[PDB]
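Minutes, project check-in

Agenda point 3 was the complex the collaborators sent over. CS summarized: seven entities, 1186 residues total, and the question is how they sit relative to each other. Sequences were read into the notes so everyone works from the same version.
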Amino acid sequence: NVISITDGQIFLETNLFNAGIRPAVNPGISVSRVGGAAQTKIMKKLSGGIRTALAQYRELAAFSQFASDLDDATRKQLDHGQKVT
Amino acid sequence: IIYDDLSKQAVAYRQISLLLRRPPGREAFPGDVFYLHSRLLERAARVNAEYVEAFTKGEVKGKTGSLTALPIIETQAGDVSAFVPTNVISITDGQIFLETNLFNAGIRPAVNPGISVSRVGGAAQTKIMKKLSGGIRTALAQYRELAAFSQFASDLDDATRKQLDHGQKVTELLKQKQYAPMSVAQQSLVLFAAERGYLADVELSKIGSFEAALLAYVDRDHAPLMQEINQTGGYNDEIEGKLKGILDSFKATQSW
Amino acid sequence: FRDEGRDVLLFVDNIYRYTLAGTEVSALLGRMPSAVGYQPTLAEEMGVLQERITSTKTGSITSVQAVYVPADDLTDPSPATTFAHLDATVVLSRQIASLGIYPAVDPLDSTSRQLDPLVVGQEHYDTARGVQSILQRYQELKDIIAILGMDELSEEDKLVVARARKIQRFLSQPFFVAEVFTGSPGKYVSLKDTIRGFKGIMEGEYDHLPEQAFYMVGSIEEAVEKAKKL
Amino acid sequence: DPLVVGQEHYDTARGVQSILQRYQELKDIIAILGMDELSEEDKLVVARARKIQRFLSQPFFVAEVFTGSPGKYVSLKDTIRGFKGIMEGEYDHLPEQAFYMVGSIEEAVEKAKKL
Amino acid sequence: DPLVVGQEHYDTARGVQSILQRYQELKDIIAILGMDELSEEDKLVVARARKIQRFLSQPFFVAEVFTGSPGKYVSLKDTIRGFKGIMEGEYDHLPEQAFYMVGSIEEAVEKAKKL
Amino acid sequence: AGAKDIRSKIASVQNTQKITKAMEMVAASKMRKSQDRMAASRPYAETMRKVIGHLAHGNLEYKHPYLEDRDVKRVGYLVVSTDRGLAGGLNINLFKKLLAEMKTWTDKGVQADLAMIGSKGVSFFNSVGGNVVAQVTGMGDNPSLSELIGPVKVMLQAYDEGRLDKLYIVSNKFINTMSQVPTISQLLPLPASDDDDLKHKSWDYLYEPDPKALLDTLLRRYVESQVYQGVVENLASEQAARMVAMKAATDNGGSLIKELQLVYNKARQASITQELTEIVSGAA
Amino acid sequence: TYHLDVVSAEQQMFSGLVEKIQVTGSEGELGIYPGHAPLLTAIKPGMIRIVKQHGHEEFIYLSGGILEVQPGNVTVLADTAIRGQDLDEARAMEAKRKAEE
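CS then shared the predicted structure for the full assembly.
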């Protein structure tokens, strides 16, 4: 019900909190309906890329770790995502 | 008789039972929902001639009457453990089970063998279909075993590569357009082509062309046999020889 | 029929349907449900049915009951309550039937809590345990054959496989009811004959006659007399 | 319905759906196998499927607030051409992101021409 | 909290939790495929996580009625030293069993001398 | 958690188990073909060794840098590894044994030297920092001798230049279908194999153009042949190791299905009980 | 007649009993007739002529190798590709360059 009522969700996860990622916000499942329309413009520019980068990083991390594998652009993306995380 | 959604009859009966203050049961259905569908579907049957003669006071004597029923049920997420689906699976003589992943893969109609079966089986079929269909079931079952070896390469085996090739070609054989029914002669001819090796060389894209062209060919040139098969459904060495001649002629002559 | 002094067989075509009929009636009368929605009286109603089927001092009723397990779940209250009362358990296999073996009983999943030396005797117990061991080892060896062919087997392994095939053939039987299909006369095999047959096949006697002499024949004497012109 | 939409549209859409189901099947065991133990037949199919999925993504005139990029408009004939273009033309010459949020087929190839 | 227990007391606890949490995520691939398909430092994480798990164990004076082993009391200026050393790998050379039911790091290396 | 997603997990793991069974079957068959390719490699090497014994242990026993024994100042290893994972610990066990002996020589002050077949060893000894001067990769399940010529030619050049005094091959041995072992064996200088016969008096070769030139070509061919034999045996060992690994994986997947189904069924029963309690306790 | 084997490291090219053969030796073409005297030499790339016993003449291409002879038994140890110090050096340098990478 409360997820249905509100304008957004900040999801806090114990698996992220236990792995040292504090504050433990999950970017993939946390959303804001207002959008960047509630940001100062400098923050708007920079933050735009961050959200997509984090979601894509998580997906790539799983894929490329159990594959135990490397490709150049994927490597670059993966170790940029780890650093922003 | 086709009941388009027995699920919705269960839902309506549930509603009207709850509004009448009748005690609720599993998933809120009243206790006798099984009895609802049971006494409904069990009406469908085949009755002997002595019953017919007794009922109609002798105005009809020799015939046996019947009512066959095809009830339809809708499952949620493919769960067959829900109350109504498992009730009606306890009631009927079999099920045709339609899978959405097969539908997405382009297998249409999406009949899922090995989990869809009719207990009446052979007894229902015409002789020719009973003779020819036995191979299809085993071939498709072997295809299911060797499906694991498909995506990962099959270059490491041979006899299984032939069994897989046949199974894939018969799996490609069974799809059909929505409003184009086939007579028993047409079905049996196509199945005879598939079983007796006559499709072994054809590539999958052109199997569809092969079926279309073969039906056109026999309707043009060999109608008398089609008429006799549609009348009798019989099978004989004389008939197998005629079918062999027809398929030999088609492979020799026409382009598909 | 028991009170007349006979020993009687009662076949129940599905015990699960009896459980469900009890559930439906209990629900219609409005009693509060229990467990996974069953009636509160489930175990009592099963006990009322099953405790009448016993051996008395005048006669007995033996019962063979078809069982359906909901959702393939052996933890569900209907199987869990029914299994409290069963003594033996017969499992029929699609795979065994495909081999041409009839009846299609599965020797490794069918069991009985009468198989103890204390009630059935040491000879019968050790024979049943022996054929179970041979068939299980044969299943593992058949996986090895599937992946690596027969070349991997030692002489001991080949002996085990051969005797296992003879045992499996020897489990088939012609019924007086099946004469319509086989045309062979039906056979009733006494327990002593069965024990002797599997004893012999296990311990290497009759290794000198082929496996098809054992198939659908009957007693082991009939197996050897089939072999002589097979 | 192929009668309603026509053959080109219908067989293009149904081909896309078939490709994506095969992709979903491979996707799970790709985690165990990587793409190392997958076969060449799988590799072509996965390439086509991945790029097709990106080509679905479109920027909306409404969503320019969220995205900064202008909203795009694509005609039915055009997108049938584009999905048939990867179906038959198979323009794997182009990076995976060239299919992403571009809209038209021409803008997809032009995005690849820019990078 | 860093303010309440000091930065060492907090950093050691968070290192212990991070290592153990990573141990959990590796268990599914270990379950399906076994340990030999892990990365060469994931193996090291597993080794240190197992050592940490064993060193959390402790003999109690009230458990002599069950274990028969003498009980142990471990002060704060000793346990954080031990765990910090295990995390930094300075005691990584002892075997796993050496850490089971020992009071302090001294008793672990001593027990390793007894194999 | 949630029974619908638990059932999704069950289906996924079942599909995984089927594919690992298929991989076990394939690995067995490939082992067979590579051990047929192994036997064909024997005759060439063994007849070459009989000729080399005829010349080297004969009275015309020239002193050749390849044939003579000298003090170790540098030592080299040719090392074979897979290009593909899922082989279990075959590579890691071989590399551990190599690390032990490479430590032992370098403690004597001896500089170590490495040439790598297969990319797994390349990555491993790039992470370790080992001294790698030659490598070849991507041979897969179709090795060829002409590809091996590069690295062996490099190591041989360092050997007859006097820079390397001894040179090993590092490889697993296909002792059985069921069992294999990692090994390190010296290929240069030529080991003192028994190789004794005196029938050479009856048939002594007419050396065209020269005896020593022919002997040099023979030794070079022999080293090439021994390296190819080691490579093929390591490939067969890879196939057997992957076979046993996939067997274990399939069994573990089934054993996980049997636990997930208990979790699922308990959740099913609990959900039915709770919903019906809400309904009955909801009325009136 | 004599037993001849033509072999390579990967596969055995040919074998059997043979009446004679002609082979391009390091110094020139040479015919090995029955029961021939002992011999050892390098052989040049090209076709070599076999005449198997009962007279079945044949051509086999070889990329080079070594030829050996003794009274009962004769064999050729063939190379798979043209061997030359320049080609071998190219392969060796390719290995070194890969090693730096």
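Noted in discussion: Chains A and C do not touch (no CB pair under 8 Å).
Follow-up: revisit at the next meeting once the mutant set is ready.
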